């Protein structure tokens, strides 16, 4: 079929459990891409489901701050997902290397995530697994764009309707409503932005225990803090935005629209 006839593979970029990602070129276009090549043979039932979902959901979204799916091909034992080429690695790896971000950069970064999140919510998509691992830098350049990735756990919603979509996501970034087993929707992604923003500024996360069942109580109680002295030189409008994102009640939590209009980002 048409991967062989349309595209040419080049170097290894990353390895998965059942997937490899390799730089490729749509030949008659001469445009380069990231081909995630997935051994469909090795995949389980729920793994297959997530792949179909990931392909349909990604294809709904077209935003500079979202890793675009351009194509989707199948070959008996392999599915090929043709994505944006991205050379800058994960935001996680960039936070460790740089340890924390200035308020300025932190603002410029969370800005792009929020716009991407806004597009998702405007397209009736909720990511559910927002974390620095799933936020990628376009290139090694010192102003490279941030793009949202891995929609394997993303879901479709009808307007502002909440429903029990299941327990899913990463413990550090799970919203209180998910953990309470309440119906949920768009606001979970804005909770995840709170935790990501908090990490950008001081370089460590607001919710952690070695004991997972205590971690989940810490999240549900809204039990985060701004310890002295490191937070004493952070601005109250930075903390204000965060407090609005880490609101326990999704109903009272700030939306992506509202957060983009926050002075800390607006100005």
């Amino acid at each position: 079929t048409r991967f062989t006839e349309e595209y040419q593979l080049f170097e290894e970029l990353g390895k998965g459990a059942f997937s490899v990602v390799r730089r490729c070129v749509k030949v008659l276009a001469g445009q380069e891409y990231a081909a995630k090549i997935i051994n469909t043979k090795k995949l389980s039932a729920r793994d297959h489901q997530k792949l179909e979902r990931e392909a349909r959901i990604c294809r709904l979204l077209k935003h500079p701050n979202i890793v675009r799916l351009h194509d989707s091909i199948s070959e008996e034992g392999h599915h090929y997902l043709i994505f944006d080429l991205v050379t800058g690695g994960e935001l996680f790896e960039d936070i460790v290397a740089r340890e924390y971000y200035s308020e300025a950069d932190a603002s410029h970064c969370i800005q792009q995530i929020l716009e991407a999140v806004l597009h998702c919510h405007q397209m009736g998509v909720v990511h559910r697994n927002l974390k620095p691992e799933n936020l990628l830098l376009a290139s090694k350049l010192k102003g490279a764009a941030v793009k949202l990735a891995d929609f394997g756990l993303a879901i479709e919603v009808e307007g502002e309707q909440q429903a029990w979509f299941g327990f899913a996501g990463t413990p550090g970034y799970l919203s209180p409503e998910v953990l309470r087993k309440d119906p949920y929707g768009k606001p979970v992604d804005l909770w995840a932005c709170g935790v990501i923003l908090y990490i950008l500024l001081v370089g460590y996360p607001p919710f952690w225990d070695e004991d997972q069942h205590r971690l989940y109580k810490q999240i549900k109680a809204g039990a985060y803090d701004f310890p002295s002295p490191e937070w004493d030189t952070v601005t109250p409008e930075a903390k204000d935005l965060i407090n609005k994102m880490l609101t326990i009640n999704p109903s009272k939590r700030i939306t992506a629209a509202e957060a983009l209009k926050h002075p800390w980002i607006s100005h």
């Binding site: 327990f167 001081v202 460590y204």
Partner: peptide, 12 residues
């Protein structure tokens, strides 16, 4: 302070 670590996704 709390440590920042790579964390894995639940799917259930």
């Amino acid at each position: 302070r709390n440590k920042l670590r790579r964390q894995h996704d639940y799917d259930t």
